[PDB]
Structures are given as C-alpha cells and as structure tokens.
Subunit: 475 residues, 4 copies
C-alpha cells in the first residue's frame, strides 16, 4: 500500500488520467490550428507555465514577506520579494513612491479588494459603462437586476462614450461627477480602442476629491514596453490582470502610491494611506494564503516584460493592429472611434445589415475566435451590433502585418457568408440562424473552406508553450 | 526581431529566469529535507502539477459549460464538466440532489460568494469564533476593528466552545440563535480537532429557518475516503478548499442542494434555491474568467481521491495522528479538547513554561515546519500558547507511525532546547530570545546536529511531484 | 378691510366646523363619565392647552435660539430658551453637565434621532423585547417581518424578562450583550411594573464601551417629582415623551451629557460628544421647523412639574397604585412581578380562565378604559392573557385612597361578567363572545348596572381642562 | 392638597405661567405690526387653534380607525375618518383611486415615511437641488458632510435649474435619471417660482420605472382651490405640510394611489402597492400615537379649504404675487425666471450690486420679514445673492394688490438704504456692514424712515386668530 500511493503521486498525467491528458492535447491542437483574435487572450511562455506547475503550490504562506504566520517560508519570501521588486521595476516605479501587492488571485477580485480597502460599503464609484467597453468588476446593473456584486456592495454610476465620436465623453463624465460625488473613479476598459486621457481623469478626480483607479488589465504589457502612455503618471491605484496584454500567469497586481502625498496649507505632511488598507483587504480581508506557484510564474513574466524582445513584440502588437484597422476600413467596415491606439478594434456591423451574434457563430465554426460586442447605436444590449478583435495572441505566434491583412480578408469572407446565411435564414431568432447554418450544406461547404484556409495559414506559425513534434494530434 | 521572440516564448525556465529556477530548486530541497508539520499543507501529485502548468491557462471561458460568452470552449467545457462529474462522484452525491461550482479561486472567496448569493448585504450569519478554532471567512471583530471583510458586508455573531470540554456548546448556540435570528449558520473550523454533530445543527437551522453551510476545508479528503461522517448528510451548502486534505491544486468548490426540498402544507412542492444564485454570485457576481488550468488539475486530483490508494492514505493520516497524540502524551504534553478525531494535534504549551513563538523559531532552525497557534487559555492574540501540527504532508511521502514517533521525539528535543534558550535569555520579550538563540556557539551546535538528524530521517522518503535525480541541490 | 375671507379666519369653531366642535364635546363627556386606566394616558392642564392653541404655531423658526434661518424669532427664542432652562431645572440638572433638545415631535422620532445622531446605519442596538414590556421605537421584528423602522435602518436584538420572577433578566442581558456587541443599550419600558436597575445598566455599558440611553417616557413625571430613582444618575442620553406621566403636551425631549466625560484612567482628556450630533440629527437631519406652540405648552408643563402640588400628585400616583394592587390581590388576582414600584399593574388573568381581549371588551362596554397585555405563559401575541391598568389619569382628577378600591371592585365585576358571557358563548372566537355580549339581554342588564356605577362614581370628580357647566353633553 | 393640583390643572395661562403668557402677547404684537413676506408662513384660523388646543390631545389611539390597539376611540375614530374624507374631498380625489394618511407629524418626517415605505435602505432618490429651490427632506450633502438624514439612509442625487432661464432643466434630469437609475423622483420645491411640468416628470418616471412623489407643501392651498394644475393628475404619491399655503395646523398628509393600476397586457389585473406600505411605515414603523388634537385642527382646515371664500383667497394670493412681481420688475429688480406662476418671487439682488444677507438685515430692522436665498449663479452659498418673498401671510390679513405695490415700494426703500450702508462700509465683510448700519445715526433714523411706515400700514389690517382689543401690547 505504502509505495503504491507514492508512485500514484509521481505518475505522469498521461498514465493516471488519459481523458484530461487527451483534453489538453485537443486544446493544444485547437490553439495551433486556430486564429485567436480575442484581445483578452494570449499565449503564455513555457517558462511561466513551468513555474506555475512547480511545487511552489505546496507552501502555505499566510501574510507578507518578513511578517508571515507560518514558518519555512525563506524561499517563498525570496520569490515574493523578487516578484514585488520586478513588478515595480517593469513599470519604472520608485519603490518609496509606489508599492505593489502581487497576492491578488485575478482581476475581478483585485478591483473588489481595492474598493473594500479604500471605500466604506455603499460609497460611490464611477466607471465606464459595460456596453461602452467597461468590465463587470467596475459595477453593472440593468433596468431589472444587479449583475456585478460591486453594484450590490457599492453604489455605481456609469460614464458613457460620445455616441457620435466613439471616444469617452469627458464633458458628460465631469458633469455627472459633480452631481454624483463619487469617492473613486475607474479609468479602465476591456472593449475600448483608444488611450485614456489620464490627465483629464486626474483633474476631474482631484476637483471631486476622488481616488483615481486605473484598470490597465487590457494594456499592461503595452505600458511595460513604453509604447502607450503609463497610467502611473496620474493614477493613485493601478490594478491589472497578469494574463492578458502582459502575457504572464492568471493572476492580478495592485499598485498604490505610498510615502508623502504633499505638504498641506498648514505645513504638515499628508502621507498616502493606501498600502496598509489594500494589503489588509487582500489578506486577511478577502483572500487566505497566496498561490506561490502563480507568484513564481508572475515573477518570470515580469523579468520577460523588461527585455528588448518584449518591447519588439508589443510595438509589433501596435503596428499589426494599425494595419488590421486599415485593412478592415478599406474592405468597407465601420470601426467605433474609426481606428485604434492599441491592441484591439471594435467593428460596428450595423451598416452591413447583420449583428455580432451571427458573425461570431460563423467565425467560430471557421476556427476564428472573436466575441460579439455592443456598439454605439444599439437599441438593446442583448442584441450586439458589433464584433471585437485583437492582435496579441497571433502576434505572440509571430504574425506580422501582411498576416493580419490575410486575417482581415478571411473575416470579410466570414461576414459575407454570415449575410448569406441570414438571407436564407428560415426565421429571425439566433436558433433559426444556426438551424439554417447547419441545415444547408452550401454554407457548411463555405465554412469548411474558410476554416481550411485559416488552419493552413495558422499551422505555418510556431506553437507557444509546447513543441509541434511531441503533440498527439498532428493531422 | 521577426522570429527572435518565439524562441524566448518556448525556452525552458532554467534558461529563462535562473534566479526563480534556483529559488524553486531551494524549495524542492527544503520539502525533501524537511519535517512538514503545517496541517493546512500537503504534497500535490505530478499529474495535477502537469495539468496546472498546461496551456489550459490560455483560454478565456467566462460563464459555464454550454453557456459561455466566448466561443472555442469545446475542450474547456469537456474539462469543467469532467471536474463537476468527478467532484460529485468523490463525495457520493446524487447529481439530481447536489450541484457543484468548481470555478471559485480559493476558500475565503468561496464562502463570500455563498453569502453574496444567499444573503442581502447586512443580513445575519452565525459562525464558530476565531480564537476557539474558526476561519477568517466566518467573520471576526475585536473591541477595535473589523479584520475579515465578511463582518464589513454582513452582520456576524459567533458561537463559542464549552471552555472546560473543548467541544462546541450546542445550547448557548441555540439560545443565542433564537435571539440573533441568523439567516445562515456556518459549521466548520481550522484549529478544531473534533468532528461536528451535523444532526443537531440541522435541527437548530430548521428551527430558526436558517441555511446550513458546512466548511469542510480541513477534512475534505477525510470525507471523500468515507473515514468520517459526510457533512452532505445534513448540510444545505458545502464549501471546501481543494489544496489541503483533498490533496489537489489551490482552489475551492461550492456544493449546493438542488431539486425537491419538501412539500409545503398547501400541497405544493418547494424546490431548493441555491444553484442559480451561487453560480451567478461566482460569475458574473465576484469573479471573471475561470482558471481552466486549476480546474483541469482539480479534475485529476478528484479522480485520484476516489481510488483505494487514496482511502489507504487518509486512514494512514488518521492512524499517524492517533500515534502522534499518544507519543506526545508519553512525553507529557497537553492536547486541547483532550485528544484528536482527525489529522491535526494542537499542543497546549502554556503549562510547559514556553509560548508558540520561541518553539516555532527553533523548529524552523531545525527544518521542522510547524506554526504558532492560540489555544483556549492564552493571554492575547500575538502571544501564542500552542503549536499546531499535522500528519497529511509527511504521510504523503510514506511516513508510517513509528516515523511520527521519531518526529515527536525530535519535536520534544526542539521544545527542550527552546526552554534551555528562554531560561538563559537575559530579557523576557521574543527579541532577547532570538538574540541569544544565534549568538551562542553551544545552542547553535545542538541546533545544527538536530537539523542533521531531521535531514537524515527526512531524505530517506521519496520526493513527491519530482525526481530526486535531477535535483540541482543534492546535499 | 379689503377682504372676502378673514370673516372665516376669526370666527370661532362655531359654525366654521359644527361636526368637529361636536366630536370634541362628545370626547369631553367621555373623559368626564369614564374610568381612564390606560397607564400612558393623562389629562393635560388648561394652561398647557391654551399655549398649544396659541399663534406661536404661525412662526417658522428652523434652527436653534440665536442660530436660526429666519428673522423675527426674538420671542420664539425666548420661549425655547425658557423651555430648555425649565427642562434642565425640572430634573435637577447642572446646565454645564447636561443639555436638552425640546424640538423632537414625539417619543418614537426622539429615539430615532438619538440613533441617527450617535450610530452609523446598521450599527447595533439592544432594548427590552416588545411583548415583555418594551416599545416599538426600540426595535421590533417577528419571525417573518420587520415591524419598527428602527429594525430596518439599525440592527436590533432584544433582552427578555425572567418569566419566573417578572423582573428584567439582567444576567442573560449581560451575556447576550457580550456576544452581540451593541453600540447602544436602551433602558426603557411601557408595560413594566418595576423600576430599572440603572446602576447595573451603567456597568454593562461601561464593560461593552456602549451608550446608555434611558427612555423614561412612562416615569418622567415620577422622576421630575423625585419619587423614583432618576435615570440621569447613570444614563449618557435620556429621552422622554412630554405627554404621559409628565402631563404636558404631546412632544418629546432629548437630554444628553456635555462637557468633560472623565480625566480617564488611561491618558487624554475625553469630552462628551453628543450635543452637536443630537442637535444636528433633529435639525437639519430629520425634522424641519419646530412646533413653537407645542414648545410653549411644554414650557408651561415643565414650570408646573417643579411645584409642590405636582410632587403631591406624583406621590399620590404611586400610593394609589400600591393600594390598587393590594385591592386586586385581596380579590384573588395575580399581578406580573407580584406587585408594582410605579404607576401601573399588569393583571395575569390566566388563573381566572379568561383572556385579556374578552375582559377589555366588557370593561370598554362599561366605560372602563384598560388594554389587553401579554403575560408570561401566553402562547402568542394574538391572544393576550392579561390586563394593564394605571393611576395617573384618574389621580389627575383627584382619585385618592379608597377610589382605586372602587376601581378594583368594578374591574372585578367586569371580569366576573366576562366569565359569564364566555360561558354562554356558542363559539370559541372573540366574534362569538362580542355577539353574545351585545345580543344576549341577560348580560345587557348587568352591563348597564356596572356602566351606571362607573359613571355615577367618575362624574363626581372635577373635569380637567374644561368646565362641567359648558358641556353640550352634560347628561 | 388634592384641591391644589386640581386647581393648578384648571387655572388659565395668564395665572399659571405669566412669563409664557407674556411671550405669546409679545408675538401677537409682532404678528400685528409687521410685513410677513416669508412665503412658507401664514396665519392660522382661530377655529383650527381651538381644535388644536382641545382635550383631543389626551387620547392615545395607536393604529387606524376601526383597527386601534386601545379602546374608547369611538370619537377619535370619527374625527380621523372625517379628516380623511375631507382631505380627499378638498383635492377632488376619487376615494377608490386615492387614499390619505393624516397621522404624519410634519413635512420632513412625512417624506421620510414615504421613502421608508417604498424603498429599501440605500435605494436611490432624485430631487431638486437645495440651492436651486429644493428642500432638505429630499436629501442634501456638501463636499464634506451629509446634511439631511435622507442622504444618510438613502442615496440621493440632485437635478438643477437651467441657470439662465430659472426653470427646471428637464432634459438634464432625464439624462441624469438614465445614468443614476432612481427608484423615486421628487417633484417639489420650497423657493421655486414656477409650476412643475408634472406630465414631463410622469414621462421620465414611466421610462425609468420610478415612483413620482409630488411634494406640494408650498402650493397645497393653491391646488385645493384649483387655481394651479393639481399634481394628483400625475403623481403616484403626494406629500404636503398642513401649515403653509393650506393654512391649517402644523402637521402633514400623505396621499397615495390605491386600487387598479393597469392590466399587465398578459391578462392579469395589477394593483397599486402604496397604501399598506405607507400606513405601516407611519405606524408602527416610525411614529407612535397620533396627535388627535392636530388631526381635529386639520379637519377644520380642510373644511375651510372647500369654501368659496377660501378659493377667493388663493386667487388673491396668485393675483397679489403677479402684481408684486410686476412692481418689482418696473422698479428694476431681477426675478429668477423673470416672474412667477405661484405665491412667491425670488429676487436676484446681485444685479443691483448687493447680496441677500445685507438686504435681509436692513429689512428685518424695519419689520419686513423676508429671507436670504441662493439664486442660481451664486459663487457658493453662505453669502447668498437673493431675497425670497411671498404673498400668503399678508393676503390672509387682507392685503389686496395696491397693498403689495406699497410692499414693493418699502422693500425697494430698504434695499436702497442697504446700498447706502454698503457705500459707507469701511470693509467688505458682513460685520463692518452691521457696524456701519447700527453706529451711524443717519442710517439708524432712516431705518425708522420705514418700520414706522411699515408698522402703520400693517396696523390698519385685521389681526388673524386674536382680537385687537384683548391684546396686551397695543401701544
Ligand atoms: C479592464 C479589466 N479589468 C478587470 C478584469 C478582470 O479579469 P479576471 O477575469 O481575471 O478576473 C478584466 C478582464 O480581464 C478587464 O478587462
Ligand atoms: C417608552 C416609550 N417610548 C416611546 C414612546 C412613543 O411616544 P409617542 O407615542 O408620543 O410617539 C412611548 C409611548 O408612550 C413609550 O412608552
Ligand atoms: C417642499 C417641502 N417639503 C417638506 C417640508 C417640511 O416641513 P416641516 O418643516 O413641517 O418638516 C417643507 C417645509 O415646509 C417644504 O416646503
């Protein structure tokens, strides 16, 4: 019995669980053969994945470096201190001006921890509306329901895009803010094509005596590589995920100002007051022990984020996206805001006579990952009139500009085939669209032709995180 | 720079971050050479670690199987459905009576998601107090501050131990419940060495029209092996972590009743109301994209947890703990509650003339990782009067029983040397103890030879999750 | 002078409203003919009613004396300052240790304003349970619904009587307070025959670092005459109505500590922090303009409360109650707590085989105003087994020594006739009892006899606030 | 001494309390000698004062007519039922579509009871901003502090006037409402010279699924005489004081929709859901026993409100205000909105090169009661730019129109004297203005240049509620 269970523990994945090993091999094939245009998705390095799947997952280390509750954390302390040092180092942060918490398990909980730390329950947040490019962790309630728990435990009011220009309406946000008296404002989007006017946000915030939180989840990589202006120039607190633009493990970081804020009008020192509160909201407030395996992975990701290879990659992300937007517009498409400053494009399909659900379904059965997105001009939010697409994943594969021109041509083909399926559709709901899409074989023929072109094009490019040879699904 | 970054993506961790690779090798040596006594720690299988370190981390899959926001989740859906199937199977649960959520990132958020799903903000919870054996996710407030976030967003009142027996006082709890009118009662603890009376707690909850939440974080593996009564016999909602007794990756699960609750007196049948609320509280309520790599790992952990080797291992952790308790009684130490029914022994060190701090410091010097603890009888919070120690970690490596007697003997040697240092310290606070402990040349000699004995006993057993051979740190 | 109205503004209640003039004359006859035994009732002086009926009602005077919004409040300021001075004088209070707010419109809002001033929303209050003798303005919730709004905006838990003695159970109060951690404890009852142990309440509040609020609405007159221990000996804040035992107009007062709290056995100088908070919670917090007509009336009532006639009256209220309790016990009745220390008695009718509802109905048919009251042993709130009666009202009319012996005799007659009507009832519900009582002529004869005895007795005594000579309904 | 205390209760006010009798006689003289222009003020009839000063104050009657806790309420039930009937009649309301609660003690608590009945704590209210003509009981918070407890227990956001036009900006309210998602919107004002566009606010509330509360405190009289559009045409709930434009005693009423709301177009009848909630929020929720003396007074006021001479008086209030505004404009004053629809004008004194504080001080020393008021465009409040003036009080005394031309002329004289004192003001701060105004016998003798004119003009008019002959201070 005694050595049998020891061998069960050291047996590899292929011997103990063939079905999970096989699901992973299938997913490897799907990542190899597919166009990944979902801008929140990326391919994480083998280095990061080896650290994430290490024995660091075994150690319980409640607390912080040099103030832990459990013993035997000398090496875990080394890893977490190195992670903090490299985090401040990646975004060019003076350690006496800025502090960082790397224990946050993911983006949504990271924001909730900031709100719990800095706000009393029911205090007021403004953030970019979800159907306008905001995240659920900013707050969201419909006409009918509280969707995000941020809206349950705090009072949230959205600020919206200018419907005609597709940029954030800062004139309506400032007016809104004088009336609503928010204690914190979130500068951070998921589905926004442009760069925040952090200077204007800081002005609105210190007039309204408000906290400036930046959610740079979507662009964190870009600001580590200096290709887009750093929110750390103006923000009081910056949160991010570690796994999007930044391309590390699934996790989060909370940066905050520390040290001296200013001298006030009586000559006394005003000290920043976010470190203790954020650190305590994370633990023992809302989390327990940290995930030291993901902290090790994040430390490796942050070392990669400071290299010239990384800077090259993210200026490529930007250039690929500029050329992608040019191709999309020249093919006869409307972008909201009419271009991009970053890693994504939001296509407004309203003028082509089809919405985002039908286009997304056709694109997916052709192995091109996009996601339906609401657009300015949408009457509903349940019926999205747009499609969101991004570069970072395929660019990580080594896609360059010509390659995104081919992907735009295949997207054009997908939209036109989706228009043909809508014309021939035997109904008006989404189920009838999918019915005629899989009840006519002309459309299934053209779907497989598009899929075939996508797979032949994608397979030419390197696999990230594993080697093509030792795969299980080569054909 | 065209293909020059692809190799940086696929390079090994040793050639990527040599400093993190080295820190991991140090921690591997520490796990191999060390007496791991921390009862919330364990050694996870290579199969789990390989799945956690896979490319499953790359996919965004907001939502649930067959109802995701993004497409291309065929394989992620397979993994999550298999995880749910194996979760229900590991605890012998009728899929028509019990449902499971496997997306919860950790234990504290899992409980908070149950509260957010089933209670309005500021509704009332009863739970086991913290300094008697509770967890922070149950709530805690002293005369000064709200520490755990749960006491911020909900109204919490504790139930206490019978101060002479060391079991839960089921009467003071019933009385205080009639007065406090709680909406939910939490059964489950950390530093509590006994198993609960679920039947009486179901009776109290039925009387007070209250929700029975069982937190089985500390005993989850023990419940899956059938060696202790299943809380699923009487509980409405069961939360657990996946990392400790269950021996899987760092995560959590929420189980909830579904289907028929009872038939009301008007003839109508009433259905449970937990599934939709809990699933929505988890996402889109408080979390974002699921961590599919940890879900894959958890699926393989749960498959291991159904096997006879696993049942043998859990009966072994129980037997090792019984022998450890007896071997400590022979030395002459006090166990709080007068013994143990499970995997942990909380030694009551007050009546030996030394605290938890000094013994833990010396044990960490000797590569014997345990943790300071407060028992009923202490003087304050951070002056601890107990040591908590657990079998599951060392038992994972093949510790048998007589091996835990040698562990008890070396712990006795550690506490005796700690007494020798405390009596000879010129001062009375922890600082004078630590000063005199490592400016000695006599006690430092005894510490190095104890550590030598510890390493000699430890290194004999197999390394769990990696091979002894390619350890970059041999001796 | 240049008008089509003014005619109706200076016309008496004459033909301006014959129906209301008539209803007032009816109520005057009812106050003359009847036994008023409801212990919260009293007869107000003519001087108070004349001040309440003055043109002081016309002035808007938001704010406080010398700190008002509007001009022309020099005389209103005189009246409010005089009211405050006489309030502090009527309870023998040093103006440098106590302050008073006389703008609170009634008892329930007065308590709510104290909570709003001193507690954040959802902070914790303890108070005497309503079916055990508490008030709704202290909090009340059933198994299904929040009844009092104090329970909506604050978290309330009750303390109970010892159902064996009939006194407040201070032991279970102290215990449940240790668990519940209240910010404020209310010492105040309605249906309670005994005096508060303010010393023990002070000790509990000092232990829990909690605010002692005494709600002396029922005994304020008794406290003003000094014939009962003063809650100002121990309380942080004292609230009262102005219209019960104190015998003024319908209103309320909030008294609070001001100046030094204690040089404190641990450091700095602590000042009482209640004045500004309470004054601001009253206005501009929860009320608008003060009712200066009611404040003038209250000033007259407080002047009367300092006279020897008034002291005689209150010691008479106490003596009448002692003799009334003796007569009730000598006629075979059970009193809750077995007697009284104050102005009322709770008769426990359970041993006489009849409930409070049937006895109250029969007493009302006889023009004896009392009210059903729950007693220990009562299963539910719907069917009370006791009767509450008190002496302030009829004592105001000059009921002396043996007059409450006649009250006891006529109550005994009502109980015995009620038992006869219960025996002859066809059904078990109160509707069948009332049907028999009005529609069975046997009982009609004895009803007329006791009503006659009641009226012939009451009519002999002086009318309070009007002349018998000018009564539209004199016979 | 039972003959004493009896006599003390029946002694008149002039005998018991000469000091209060004297203060009332002083206030009578002040009501006789002066121009009352504060538009929230009025002179109550002797009829309602005699009912308010009646023995109805003595009866406790918690509950509602036909459902009281205490017996002996047959005549109080008559008065409350008559009050309800006459309330619904005086506003021409179908008793099967509207119900009324007449127990509410005053305006501020009446609104708080509506919020407590119809909203959960922390739910959202929109109301007219306080410096734009709103009331504190609709919510108010500054940069630093929460002023009204409505803003403590509920989440409040204001809507503003158009700063150029002086009408409510209904566009900006609709926009704000989309973003802020209010559960209730308040159509109601205290310093707003126009009638609400109730139809537009019905449209906004129907769009936002929001409750329309009208607060007609200032215009209830005008609505009762039918000389302005009735908010009941559109509101879900109407609140009012009883003591301003309506001219009754100090109290409040809550009207609400009851019965059928609409057919849900699925077949079902949906019923209005206000009556039970509001009635329970008033009692037992936030109040105790009703003030039956005030309810009797209100019944008399409501009977007067249905007479032709009442309609004449309210038509007169309107005509007097039109002529007052015309006189002010022909004398070169700036009125916010350029005129009036109702009983008041808000004069913008900044166009004459002075503020509201200086003009108010000079007017008060001349016995012209007005009040400083924020005009839209003020550089903050604290020093307001306007004076608020109204016609109901002096119109009650019989001021006809030519009389308000004299009022306008004497106000103009007061403003010009204040300008002369500002010219001589050595400094700019208000203390130097008061110093110059008192210490400069040129200005002191011109102040008596009016006051004398004002006093002679006021003395020529009838005293309301008392007799010129029986007055004490007749010289
Ligand atoms: C702007 C922004 N903030 C926060 C998050 C939260 O991410 P997660 O799903 O890891 O919780 C996201 C999503 O990735 C995001 O786009
Ligand atoms: C102790 C106590 N508090 C508060 C109140 C409420 O006073 P009111 O009915 O004037 O609102 C009462 C009623 O008499 C009372 O007895
Ligand atoms: C619009 C409005 N609401 C509420 C109130 C509150 O009145 P009170 O001072 O009687 O509380 C007023 C004042 O008269 C008012 O004008």
């Amino acid at each position: 019995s005694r050595v049998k269970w020891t061998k069960q523990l050291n047996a590899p994945l292929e011997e103990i669980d063939p079905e999970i090993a096989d699901i992973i091999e299938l997913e490897k094939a799907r990542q190899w053969k597919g166009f990944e245009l979902i801008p929140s998705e990326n391919f994480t390095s083998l280095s990061v994945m080896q650290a994430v799947g290490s024995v660091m997952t075994n150690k319980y280390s409640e607390g912080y470096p040099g103030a832990r509750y459990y013993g035997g954390n000398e090496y875990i302390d080394m890893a977490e201190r190195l992670c903090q040092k490299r985090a401040l180092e990646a975004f060019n942060l003076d350690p006496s001006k800025w502090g960082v918490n790397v224990q946050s398990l993911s983006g949504s909980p990271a924001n909730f921890q900031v709100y719990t730390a800095l706000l009393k329950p029911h205090e007021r947040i403004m953030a970019l509306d979800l159907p306008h490019g905001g995240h659920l962790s900013h707050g969201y309630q419909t006409d009918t329901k509280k969707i995000s728990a941020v809206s349950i435990f705090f009072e949230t009011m959205p600020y919206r895009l200018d419907e005609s220009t597709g940029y954030i309406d800062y004139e309506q946000m400032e007016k809104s803010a004088v009336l609503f008296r928010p204690k914190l404002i979130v500068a951070g989007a998921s589905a926004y094509a442009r760069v925040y006017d952090y200077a204007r946000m800081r002005k609105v915030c210190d007039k309204q005596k408000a906290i400036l939180l930046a959610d740079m989840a979507h662009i964190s990589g870009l600001v580590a590589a200096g290709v887009v202006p750093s929110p750390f120039e103006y923000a009081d607190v910056v949160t991010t995920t570690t796994h999007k633009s930044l391309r590390g493990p699934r996790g989060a970081m909370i940066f905050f100002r520390k040290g001296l804020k200013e001298i006030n009008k009586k000559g006394e020192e005003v000290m920043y007051d976010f470190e203790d509160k954020i650190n305590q909201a994370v633990f023992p407030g809302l989390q327990g022990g940290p995930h030291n395996h993901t902290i090790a992975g994040l430390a490796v990701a942050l070392k990669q984020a400071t290299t010239p290879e990384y800077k090259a990659y993210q200026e490529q992300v930007l250039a690929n996206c500029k050329r992608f937007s040019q191709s999309l517009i020249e093919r006869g498409y409307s972008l909201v805001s009419g271009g991009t400053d970053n890693h994504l494009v939001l296509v407004n399909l309203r003028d082509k006579g089809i919405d985002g659900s039908r286009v997304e379904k056709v694109m997916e059965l052709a192995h091109i990952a996009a996601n339906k997105n609401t657009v300015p001009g949408d009457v509903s939010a349940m019926v999205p009139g747009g499609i969101r697409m991004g570069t970072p994943a395929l660019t990580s594969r080594g896609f360059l500009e010509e390659d995104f021109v081919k992907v735009a041509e295949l997207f054009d083909a997908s939209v036109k085939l989706a228009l043909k399926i809508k014309a021939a559709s035997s109904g008006t709901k989404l189920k009838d669209f999918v019915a005629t899409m899989n009840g006519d074989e002309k459309f299934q023929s053209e779907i497989k032709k598009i899929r075939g072109e996508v797979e032949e094009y994608a397979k030419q490019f390197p696999t990230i995180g594993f080697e093509k040879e030792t795969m299980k699904y080569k054909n």
